[PDB]
Amino acid sequence: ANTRVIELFDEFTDLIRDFIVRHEITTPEYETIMQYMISVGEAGEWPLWLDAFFETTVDSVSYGKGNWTSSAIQGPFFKEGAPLLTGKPATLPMRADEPGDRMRFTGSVRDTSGTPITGAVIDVWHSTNDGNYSFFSPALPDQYLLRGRVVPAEDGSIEFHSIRPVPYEIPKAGPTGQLMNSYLGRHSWRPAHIHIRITADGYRPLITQLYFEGDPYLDSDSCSAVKSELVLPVNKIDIDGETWQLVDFNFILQHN
Amino acid sequence: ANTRVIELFDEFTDLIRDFIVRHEITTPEYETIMQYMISVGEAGEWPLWLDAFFETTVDSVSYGKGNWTSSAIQGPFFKEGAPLLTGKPATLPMRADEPGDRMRFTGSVRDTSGTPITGAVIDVWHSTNDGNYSFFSPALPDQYLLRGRVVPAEDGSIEFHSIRPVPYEIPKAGPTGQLMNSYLGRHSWRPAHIHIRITADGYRPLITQLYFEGDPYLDSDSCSAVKSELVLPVNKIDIDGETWQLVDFNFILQHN
Numbered sequence: 001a002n003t004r005v006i007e008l009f010d011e012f013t014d015l016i017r018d019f020i021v022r023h024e025i026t027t028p029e030y031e032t033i034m035q036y037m038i039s040v041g042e043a044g045e046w047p048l049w050l051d052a053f054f055e056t057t058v059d060s061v062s063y064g065k066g067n068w069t070s071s072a073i074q075g076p077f078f079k080e081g082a083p084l085l086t087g088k089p090a091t092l093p094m095r096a097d098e099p100g101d102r103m104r105f106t107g108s109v110r111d112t113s114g115t116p117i118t119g120a121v122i123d124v125w126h127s128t129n130d131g132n133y134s135f136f137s138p139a140l141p142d143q144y145l146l147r148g149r150v151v152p153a154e155d156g157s158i159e160f161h162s163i164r165p166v167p168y169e170i171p172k173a174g175p176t177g178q179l180m181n182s183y184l185g186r187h188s189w190r191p192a193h194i195h196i197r198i199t200a201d202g203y204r205p206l207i208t209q210l211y212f213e214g215d216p217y218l219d220s221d222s223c224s225a226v227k228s229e230l231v232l233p234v235n236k237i238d239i240d241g242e243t244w245q246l247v248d249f250n251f252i253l254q255h256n
Numbered sequence: 257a258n259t260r261v262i263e264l265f266d267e268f269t270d271l272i273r274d275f276i277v278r279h280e281i282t283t284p285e286y287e288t289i290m291q292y293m294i295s296v297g298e299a300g301e302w303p304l305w306l307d308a309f310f311e312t313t314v315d316s317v318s319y320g321k322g323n324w325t326s327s328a329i330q331g332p333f334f335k336e337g338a339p340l341l342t343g344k345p346a347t348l349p350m351r352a353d354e355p356g357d358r359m360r361f362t363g364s365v366r367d368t369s370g371t372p373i374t375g376a377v378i379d380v381w382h383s384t385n386d387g388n389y390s391f392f393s394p395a396l397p398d399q400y401l402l403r404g405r406v407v408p409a410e411d412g413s414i415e416f417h418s419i420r421p422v423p424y425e426i427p428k429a430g431p432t433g434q435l436m437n438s439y440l441g442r443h444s445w446r447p448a449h450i451h452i453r454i455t456a457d458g459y460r461p462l463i464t465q466l467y468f469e470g471d472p473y474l475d476s477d478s479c480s481a482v483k484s485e486l487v488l489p490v491n492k493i494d495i496d497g498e499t500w501q502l503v504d505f506n507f508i509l510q511h512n
């Protein structure tokens with residue numbers, strides 16, 4: 001017996017019973033709830049459904065804002081052991097002719113005092129423009145595509161190269177899409193994002209997400225996960241007729 | 257409804273977010289809840305789980321208080337198409353030497369006024385002395401045993417014969433069970449009960465349960481299903497091994 005759970009569960013039972021009474025939750029209503037949950041099981045979407053609606057809140061109690069980088073959710077599609085990119089310019093493993101424009105990501109990783117953190121590993125992950133993540137779609141191999149680890153050079157600079165990401169929409173036919181589009185008459189679009197996770201000994205882990213300026217769904221996140229201080233300016237440099245989206249974010253890790 | 261599901265969701269959401277924020281629910285925590293909700297769904301347990309925690313309250317929303325036979329929960333163990341029983345004695349289909357105490361039930365099915373209701377049809381099921389329901393158990397056939405339909409006489413009266421039910425315990429090593437035993441530090445034991453569903457045209461269908469005096473889990477039912485007015489007083493009588501437990505109860509339903 002955990003007393004954390006005896007205390008949380010019992011309050012939580014007493015709340016939901018009251019919700020039921022306040023809102024006259026009927027039996028067929030009930031049977032539909034029960035039934036919808038079941039089908040969230042079957043599509044394997046519990047982690048999407050919950051993160052969709054609640055990661056944002058658990059992430060607000062979990063970390064604080066100040067003079068460093070802000071956390072943001074991790075969502076459902078992170079995968080461990082993604083591969084070290086070393087290279088002439090390091091480039092997310094990706095497909096022959098992987099759809100989209102070329103994107104150069106530059107930046108640095110440092111502590112709340114300015115010092116650069118040579119001992120860090122940035123994991124990145126993002127979804128094809130087709131709108132799937134590797135390891136989690138039947139439209140993509142269980143391989144590491146668009147996922148990789150980067151390491152600050154000894155002066156703290158980071159830079160990698162990938163496609164530039166575009167607005168993702170949660171499968172409109174899954175339980176989560178269906179609630180979102182139909183039952184809620186809304187939408188299931190997220191704005192484009194690069195997911196980052198940075199770790200370093202001596203520092204507190206960072207899980208966050210970089211967004212893009214003027215993004216269609218900037219204010220519309222069907223996951224409600226956006227924070228302005230993370231909406232990024234894009235710049236457009238040509239080299240041999242070839243249009244790099246340039247982006248640049250400077251990470252601060254907190255100590256301990 | 258597009259509009260009903262909206263009012264509730266958005267209210268359910270807010271509630272749930274406030275829970276998370278108030279108790280500062282951590283990320284490991286959140287992920288533990290995520291897994292438990294997965295587990296429950298990979299066992300076949302939403303119906304048992306949800307029924308155990310809230311069907312009582314869902315049921316209170318849908319009947320009233322008052323004179324109407326005092327409702328109870330269907331459980332997750334109903335089964336359509338139990339056989340009409342006639343035989344003069346009128347017993348529930350059971351195996352030879354079907355274990356345990358033989359039991360006799362008397363009573364009636366009247367309306368608000370007290371006028372016998374003839375179109376009533378009444379189903380009764382329960383579980384073995386060993387604690388199994390027909391059809392949901394490898395240790396019994398997928399065939400009607402201790403499940404049946406009985407029709408009232410012209411004057412009110414009703415009789416069916418079975419064996420006496422005894423306390424049932426919810427699987428000790430599945431998620432519900434674990435929650436009830438390992439994380440909550442309690443038990444998964446429901447009090448001896450006999451299920452009932454009564455029906456008539458021009459009347460609001462009825463569902464409920466009868467428990468017995470001295471039943472240990474009366475006052476700590478795991479699914480909080482027990483209403484004092486549905487505890488049956490037991491009259492121990494011995495027609496010399498076998499030994500009859502005789503009970504009686506007076507059903508009433510509401511009109512239209």
Ligand SMILES: Oc1cccc(O)c1O
Binds near residue numbers: 073127223
């Ligand atoms: O990073 C994400 C978080 C939540 C839902 C998603 O579809 C996603 O890509």
Ligand SMILES: [Fe+3]
Binds near residue numbers: 193
């Ligand atoms: Fe994402």
